[PDB]
Design a binder for this molecule. Structure first.
Ligand SMILES: Nc1ncnc2c1ncn2[C@@H]1O[C@H](COP(=O)(O)OP(=O)(O)OP(=O)(O)O)[C@@H](O)[C@H]1O
Ligand SMILES: [Mg+2]
Lengths: 269, 52, 115, 340, 52, 115, 86
C-alpha cells in the first residue's frame, strides 16, 4: 500500500530490539549468580571424596558395589542458543559405543525440553523431573537420583553417567558425559560400623555430583541466552535498516505523485 | 457386594446393547433420509426440460 | 483541564490514568513477540491495571441500546474520579479484567465479577 | 478475487421466497462473467425475481457511468408503490473510472487522483435513493391506490481496494456515505475462513433494529467479543498458562471463529442460523473439538430438520422467541449430544 | 469385573458408532448417483429436443 | 477452482496447500528474529511441510534444458494431486527437504532421497 | 525544513514525553543552540555540564530501569542519578 504500513512495522521491531539488548545483560547478571553458586558447593564434594578414598584404602575388609565393574540435564525455557541440541547430538556419540558393545540403556530426565525430546523419538524414561527454578535445591534431585542408584544395586545398570553442559568460558558451553557410580599413615575412630558410614557417604557423593552438574548447566544456559538475545538484537537491526530503505522509496514516490497531480490540475484551470 | 456388583454390571451391559442398537438404528434412519432428499432434489432438477 | 479551573484531585487522577496508558503503549508490542513472563514485577502489575483502565473507560449509552442490547448508564463526575483512583491505587487488583467492560460506575464492576 | 460478488449474488438468491425484488448492475465486467452470474441465478431459481442491467467493458464510458442510475430507477418503481427491493452495484470503482474518463475528455479540471472534483457527489446522489418511505409517501405517490404499507430499496454497493489501501479517494468517499460496511480480508481468505469477514473492521449502523427477535437475542455482543478474541489470541500467543477467565474467552472465540465459516450457494434459514448460534452462546460447543464444529453443526441441523420439523417451522414464521422455544431448542440439543 | 464391564461397554459403543458412520457415508455416496444420473438424462433429452 | 468443476479431492488438496503456505508466510518475521526453535510443536511440523510443498511445486521444463542441463518433466493431474495429498497427510515427513526440489512426479522424490 | 535551516537552534517538544508527565516536553537529545555557552551566565554555564551528562547517561540506560536489581553498582549509580535529574 504505502509509507504508513512500513512506519508501523519499523516501530514494532524497534520496540522489540530495545528489550533484547537489555535482556542480554539480565542473562549476564543471572550467569554471575549461577557462577557463585557453582563455587559455593565445591568444598563439600571434595571433602566427601577425600573421606571415601582413605576409608576404602585403609579398610580392605569391604568393597562397596559402586567400586567394582544416563541422567540428562536440560532447560525448562526458550532462548537457548543451541545448548540442548548440542547435548542431545553428543549423547548419541557415547550411545553408539554402547550399541557396538551390545549394552542396554536406562534414561533419567531433568527439565521440560529433555522430556519433550525423548517423548518425540520413543526413548525409555525410568525417571523424570521438570519445572525447576533458575536457582534449584538439591532435595528435589533425591528422587530421580535414587531410582538410578537402585537400578545399579538391582544389577540392571553396569555404568551410570550424567549428561550436561560445562562452562568452558562466557562464550562457550561444552556438552559432556561424566561417569557417576563407578569411581596411609593413620586410621579413623568410627563410632557406627564402617559399612554404614561408607554406604551413607557414597549416596551423598553421587547426589552432590548431580547437583553440581545441574547448577553448572544453569550457568551454561544463562550464557547461551545472552548470545541468543545478542543475536536477536542484531538480526532486528538488519530488518529495520532494510525497511528504512523501502520507506524512503515510498517518501520520494508520494512527493513525485502529489506534484504530478497538482501540476496537471493547475494546467487545466 | 460382589453379587450386587454383578447386577450393576448387568445394567451397564444391557444399557450398552440398547445404546449401541439405537446408534445403528439412527444411522439407518439418517441413511433413508439422505436418499429421500436426493430423490426430491433429482425430481426438482428436472426444471431443465424448460429452463435449459 | 487545569488545577486552577477544576481542582488538583481531578487533575492528578486524569494525569495518573494518562501516565499508566502511555507506559502500556510501549509494552504492548513487546509482549506479542517475547511474551509477558519476561517483564518486571512492577510492569506486570501496571500492564494489568492499564488493561482494566482501558475497559473501565467503556459505558453503555441510552441511545446505543439498539447496538449493545444492555441498558444505558449515566455516571457522575465524583463517581468517575473515585472509580479511576481505586484502580490506580490497587483497590481492585483482585477483580478479573472482563468485570470492567461495559458497566457504568465502579460498584457494578464489583457485581459483574460475581457473574 | 476474495468473494465480493459471491456474497452479493448469494444475498440475491436468498430473496426468491422473501417477497423482495432484486436488481444486479454489472459495470465494466467482461460479458462472459455476466453470463456466468446469470447462469448461477438461473441454476439457483433466483432469475425470475431479478432484473439484470449490463454495461460491459467494451461499452461506451457514458453507458457505464449511467448504468447504476438506470438500475436504481428500476428498483425505485417497487419502493414508490409500497413494495421492497434490493440492488447490487458490482463495481462502483469502475463507474468512477468511467466518469473520470468523460470528465477528462470534456477538459474539466482534475482533483486528488486525477478524479473530477464532484466524484463524491457521483456516489452520494446514487446511494441516497436507497431508503424506506412512510405510508403517507406511498399513499400520496399511488393517489390512495396503496394504503397502510411502507416501501423500500436496499443497496449492496461493491468497492475494490489495491493491496488493502483504504486511503484512496473513491473508497474514502463511499465508506463515508453508507450505513455500514463488510470488509473482506485476503489473509483470512487464504487461511480458509472463506466468507472472509473481518469482524473488527466491519460494522452496521442500524444494528439490532434490522434483526428478528431470536437472532437479536442470540447474537448480542458476538461482534465485539470476536474483535476482543483476535486481540487476546495475539497477546497470549507465546505467554505461559493464564487464568480461567482468559482460557474461557480464548476457547470460546476459537469455536465461534470456526462456526462463522460457510460454503458458497448454501444459505441458512432463520431456524438453522438460530440453532447454530444457540449451541455456541449457551455453552453446548464447550465439549466439541474445533476440528469437529462444522460436522456438529451440519449433523444438528439435519437432526432438528428430522425430529423437530414443527419447531423450525414455528421459528421461521417471524423469527419470534420465548421461554417455550428456548426450552424446546435446549431439550433437542441435549437429546442430540446425549445420543449422536 | 466392574473395570472389564466398563471397558467392554465402551468398546462396543465405539464400534457401533464406527458402523453408524459407515452406514451414513454409503447413503451420501448413493445420493450423488441419484442426482447425476438425473442431470445427464435431463440435459441429453433437452439437447435431443433442441436438435429436433 | 470449484468443487462442482474439478471434484472434491482436487479442491481439498489445493485448499490444504494454500492453508499451509499462508500459515508459513505469517511466521516469517518471528523466524527471522527468534529462529525456528521457538515455535510450537504444531507450528514446527507445519513449517516443515510448508518447506517441502514449496519445493515440490518446482519442475524442470523441456524449454529450460539449455539453461541448466536437466531433462524436462511432464506431470499428470493424477500424479500432482497424489504427491501434494501425501505431503499434507504426512506420508513423507521422514524424507529430506532437498529431495522435493526439481523432480517432476512424487515417486522421483523417493528415489532422490536415496543419495 | 526551510525554517529549521534558517534558525540558530531548535527546541523540539514531543507528544510521547508530554503524555508521560514530562510537562515542558523538551526533547534535550535532539534540541540544540548553535550559540551555546556564550548565551549563559557564569553560574548556569558551570552547573549545566554535569546535568547534560546525566540526561545523556539516562537516555543510554533507560531500558534497564525495569531490571535495576540485576545491574552493576557503578551502572546503578548513573541510572538512579539520571532518573532524579530527569
Ligand atoms: N463461501 C465460499 N466458499 C468457498 N469458496 C468461495 C466462497 N465464496 C466465494 N468462493 C470462491 O472464491 C472465488 C471468489 O470469486 P468472486 O468472483 O466472488 O470474488 P470477487 O471479489 O468478486 O472477484 P473479482 O474481483 O474477480 O470480481 C470464487 O472462486 C468462488 O467460487
Ligand atoms: Mg466480482
Amino acid at each position: 500500500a504505502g509509507a504508513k504500513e512500513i512506519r508501523s512495522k519499523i516501530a514494532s521491531i524497534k520496540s522489540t530490539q530495545k528489550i533484547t539488548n537489555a535482556m542480554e545483560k539480565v542473562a549476564v547478571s543471572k550467569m554471575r549468580k549461577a557462577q557463585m553458586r557453582m563455587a559455593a558447593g565445591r568444598p563439600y564434594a571434595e571433602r566427601i571424596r577425600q573421606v571415601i578414598g582413605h576409608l576404602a584404602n585403609a579398610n580392605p575388609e569391604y568393597r562397596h558395589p559402586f567400586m567394582v565393574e544416563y541422567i540428562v540435564v536440560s532447560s525448562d525455557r526458550g532462548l537457548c542458543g543451541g545448548l540442548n541440541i548440542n547435548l542431545f547430538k553428543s549423547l548419541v556419540k557415547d550411545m553408539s559405543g554402547y550399541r557396538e558393545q551390545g549394552a542396554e540403556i536406562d534414561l533419567c530426565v531433568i527439565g521440560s525440553k529433555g522430556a519433550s525430546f525423548f517423548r518425540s523419538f520413543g526413548g525409555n524414561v525410568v525417571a523424570a523431573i521438570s519445572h525447576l527454578g533458575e536457582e534449584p535445591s538439591i532435595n528435589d534431585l533425591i528422587g530421580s537420583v535414587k531410582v538410578m542408584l537402585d537400578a545399579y544395586l538391582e544389577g540392571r545398570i553396569d555404568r551410570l553417567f550424567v549428561v550436561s553442559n560445562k562452562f568452558v568460558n562466557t562464550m562457550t558451553q561444552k556438552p559432556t558425559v561424566e561417569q557417576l557410580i563407578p569411581l596411609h599413615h593413620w586410621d579413623y575412630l568410627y563410632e557406627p560400623d564402617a559399612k554404614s558410614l561408607l554406604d551413607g557417604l557414597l549416596v551423598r557423593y553421587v547426589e552432590s555430583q548431580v547437583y553440581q552438574a545441574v547448577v553448572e548447566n544453569n550457568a551454561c544456559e544463562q550464557a547461551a541466552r545472552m548470545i541468543a538475545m545478542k543475536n536477536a538484537t542484531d538480526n532486528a537491526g538488519e530488518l529495520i535498516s532494510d525497511l528504512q530503505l523501502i520507506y524512503n522509496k515510498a517518501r520520494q514516490a508520494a512527493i513525485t505523485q502529489e506534484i504530478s497531480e497538482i501540476v496537471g490540475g493547475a494546467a487545466a484551470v | 457386594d460382589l453379587e450386587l456388583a454383578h447386577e450393576k454390571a448387568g445394567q451397564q451391559l444391557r444399557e450398552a446393547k440398547a445404546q449401541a442398537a439405537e446408534i445403528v438404528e439412527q444411522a439407518k434412519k439418517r441413511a433413508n433420509q439422505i436418499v429421500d432428499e436426493a430423490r426430491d432434489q433429482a425430481r426438482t432438477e428436472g426444471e431443465r426440460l424448460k429452463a435449459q | 483541564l487545569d488545577p486552577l479551573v477544576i481542582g488538583q484531585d481531578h487533575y492528578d487522577t486524569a494525569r495518573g490514568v494518562q501516565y499508566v496508558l502511555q507506559r502500556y503503549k510501549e509494552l504492548k508490542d513487546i509482549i506479542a513477540i517475547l511474551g509477558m513472563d519476561e517483564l518486571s514485577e512492577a510492569d506486570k502489575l501496571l500492564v494489568a491495571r492499564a488493561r482494566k483502565i482501558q475497559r473501565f473507560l467503556s459505558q453503555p449509552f441510552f441511545v446505543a441500546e439498539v447496538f449493545t442490547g444492555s441498558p444505558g448508564k449515566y455516571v457522575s463526575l465524583k463517581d468517575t474520579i473515585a472509580g479511576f483512583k481505586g484502580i490506580l491505587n490497587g483497590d481492585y487488583d483482585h477483580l478479573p479484567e472482563q468485570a470492567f467492560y461495559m458497566v457504568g460506575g465502579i460498584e457494578e464492576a464489583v457485581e459483574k465479577a460475581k457473574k | 478475487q476474495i468473494g465480493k460478488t459471491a456474497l452479493a449474488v448469494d444475498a440475491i438468491i436468498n430473496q426468491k421466497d422473501s417477497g423482495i425484488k432484486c436488481v444486479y448492475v454489472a459495470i465494466g465486467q467482461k460479458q462472459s462473467t455476466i453470463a456466468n452470474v446469470v447462469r448461477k441465478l438461473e441454476e439457483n431459481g433466483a432469475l425470475a425475481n431479478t432484473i439484470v442491467v449490463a454495461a460491459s467493458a467494451s461499452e461506451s464510458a457514458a453507458l457505464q457511468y449511467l448504468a447504476p442510475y438506470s438500475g436504481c430507477t428500476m428498483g425505485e418503481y417497487f419502493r414508490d408503490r409500497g413494495e421492497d427491493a434490493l440492488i447490487v452495484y458490482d463495481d462502483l470503482s469502475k463507474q468512477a473510472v468511467a466518469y473520470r474518463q468523460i470528465s477528462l475528455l470534456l477538459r474539466r479540471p482534475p482533483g486528488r487522483e486525477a478524479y473530477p472534483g464532484d466524484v463524491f457527489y457521483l456516489h452520494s446522489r446514487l446511494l441516497e435513493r436507497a431508503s424506506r418511505v412512510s405510508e403517507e409517501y406511498v399513499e400520496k405517490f399511488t393517489n390512495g391506490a396503496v394504503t397502510g404499507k411502507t416501501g423500500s430499496l436496499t443497496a449492496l454497493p461493491i468497492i475494490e481496494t489495491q493491496a488493502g489501501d483504504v486511503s484512496a479517494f473513491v473508497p474514502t468517499n463511499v465508506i463515508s456515505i453508507t450505513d455500514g460496511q463488510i470488509f473482506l480480508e485476503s489473509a483470512m481468505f487464504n487461511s480458509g475462513i472463506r466468507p472472509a469477514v473481518n469482524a473488527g473492521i466491519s460494522v452496521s449502523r442500524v444494528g439490532g433494529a434490522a434483526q428478528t427477535k431470536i437472532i437479536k437475542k442470540l447474537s448480542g455482543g458476538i461482534r465485539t467479543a470476536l474483535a476482543q478474541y483476535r486481540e487476546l489470541a495475539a497477546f497470549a500467543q507465546f505467554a505461559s498458562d493464564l487464568d480461567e477467565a482468559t482460557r474461557k474467552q480464548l476457547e470460546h472465540g476459537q469455536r465461534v471463529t470456526e462456526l462463522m465459516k460457510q460454503k458458497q450457494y448454501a444459505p441458512m434459514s432463520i431456524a438453522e442460523m438460530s440453532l447454530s448460534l444457540y449451541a455456541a452462546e449457551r455453552g453446548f460447543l464447550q465439549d466439541v473439538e474445533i476440528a469437529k464444529v462444522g460436522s456438529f453443526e451440519q449433523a444438528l441441523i439435519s437432526y432438528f430438520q428430522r425430529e423437530h420439523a414443527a419447531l423450525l417451522a414455528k421459528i421461521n414464521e417471524k423469527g419470534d422467541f420465548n421461554d417455550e422455544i428456548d426450552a424446546g431448542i435446549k431439550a433437542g440439543i441435549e437429546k442430540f449430544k446425549a445420543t449422536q
